Design an enzyme around this catalytic site. Sequence first.
Site, PDB file in Angstrom:
ATOM      1  N   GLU A 292     -76.968  14.520  71.471  1.00  0.00           N
ATOM      2  CA  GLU A 292     -78.129  15.639  71.598  1.00  0.00           C
ATOM      3  C   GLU A 292     -78.285  16.216  70.438  1.00  0.00           C
ATOM      4  OE1 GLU A 292     -79.528  16.716  73.984  1.00  0.00           O
ATOM      5  OE2 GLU A 292     -78.571  15.772  75.804  1.00  0.00           O
TER       6      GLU A 292
ATOM      7  N   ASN B  49     -89.668  21.233  73.704  1.00  0.00           N
ATOM      8  CA  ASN B  49     -89.935  20.489  74.999  1.00  0.00           C
ATOM      9  C   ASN B  49     -91.395  20.580  75.360  1.00  0.00           C
ATOM     10  OD1 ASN B  49     -87.196  19.951  75.425  1.00  0.00           O
ATOM     11  ND2 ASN B  49     -86.993  21.968  76.335  1.00  0.00           N
TER      12      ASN B  49
ATOM     13  N   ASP C 154     -93.213  21.530  77.833  1.00  0.00           N
ATOM     14  CA  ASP C 154     -93.393  22.649  78.797  1.00  0.00           C
ATOM     15  C   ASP C 154     -93.430  23.974  78.108  1.00  0.00           C
ATOM     16  OD1 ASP C 154     -90.649  23.081  78.400  1.00  0.00           O
ATOM     17  OD2 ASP C 154     -90.349  23.690  80.759  1.00  0.00           O
TER      18      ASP C 154
ATOM     19  N   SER D  93     -90.597  25.393  76.180  1.00  0.00           N
ATOM     20  CA  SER D  93     -89.229  25.737  76.155  1.00  0.00           C
ATOM     21  C   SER D  93     -88.628  25.031  75.067  1.00  0.00           C
ATOM     22  CB  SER D  93     -88.342  25.308  77.373  1.00  0.00           C
ATOM     23  OG  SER D  93     -88.476  24.011  77.717  1.00  0.00           O
TER      24      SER D  93
ATOM     25  N   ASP E 218     -84.968  23.441  72.965  1.00  0.00           N
ATOM     26  CA  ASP E 218     -83.331  23.204  73.194  1.00  0.00           C
ATOM     27  C   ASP E 218     -82.697  23.813  72.107  1.00  0.00           C
ATOM     28  OD1 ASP E 218     -83.924  22.133  75.686  1.00  0.00           O
ATOM     29  OD2 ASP E 218     -83.653  19.980  75.078  1.00  0.00           O
TER      30      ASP E 218
ATOM     31  N   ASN F 148     -81.351  24.471  76.904  1.00  0.00           N
ATOM     32  CA  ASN F 148     -82.632  24.937  77.240  1.00  0.00           C
ATOM     33  C   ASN F 148     -82.948  26.155  77.587  1.00  0.00           C
ATOM     34  OD1 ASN F 148     -85.535  24.583  77.961  1.00  0.00           O
ATOM     35  ND2 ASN F 148     -85.144  22.912  79.301  1.00  0.00           N
TER      36      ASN F 148
ATOM     37  N   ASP G 297     -73.124  23.940  87.956  1.00  0.00           N
ATOM     38  CA  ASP G 297     -74.198  24.387  88.486  1.00  0.00           C
ATOM     39  C   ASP G 297     -74.604  23.407  89.626  1.00  0.00           C
ATOM     40  OD1 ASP G 297     -76.021  22.243  87.502  1.00  0.00           O
ATOM     41  OD2 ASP G 297     -77.368  23.662  86.908  1.00  0.00           O
TER      42      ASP G 297
END
Length: 129
Positions: free
Chosen positions: A35, A46, A48, A50, A52, A59, A101
């Site tokens: 990562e 990203n 969209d 957003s 990271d 994110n 989650d």
Amino acid sequence: KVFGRCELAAAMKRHGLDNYRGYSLGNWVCAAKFESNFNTQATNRNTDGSTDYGILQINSRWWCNDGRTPGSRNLCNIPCSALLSSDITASVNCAKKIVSDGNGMNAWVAWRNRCKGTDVQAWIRGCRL
Ligand SMILES: [Cl-]
Ligand SMILES: [Cl-]
Ligand SMILES: [Cl-]
Ligand code: NA
């Protein structure tokens, strides 16, 4: 800060990630390697809008507030810049929420594609833990 392999493993073990939700320590070191290349200051945008952040590339669409991801959530209740600190506490605590989650470590694309199903214990081999 750019961690060494065994240095990061020890810090994650101290923060309770070894076998957290059933994921052995090597999984977390492998994820961090691919990562962020072990770099707490890593950021990546990203498509969209957003971003990271940090050693585990958390994110801003869901997990932290960066002031520039409209309509997003802040489920870890932290500014995203806290995830860039040389102290990995905030990243580890937020990662514990993510992994709990329901999707496990599949939340981390690099883990699914480069760590899952491999000999992850090799990532902590030789380390004094
Ligand atoms: Cl392991
Ligand atoms: Cl925002
Ligand atoms: Cl799981
Ligand atoms: Na956010």
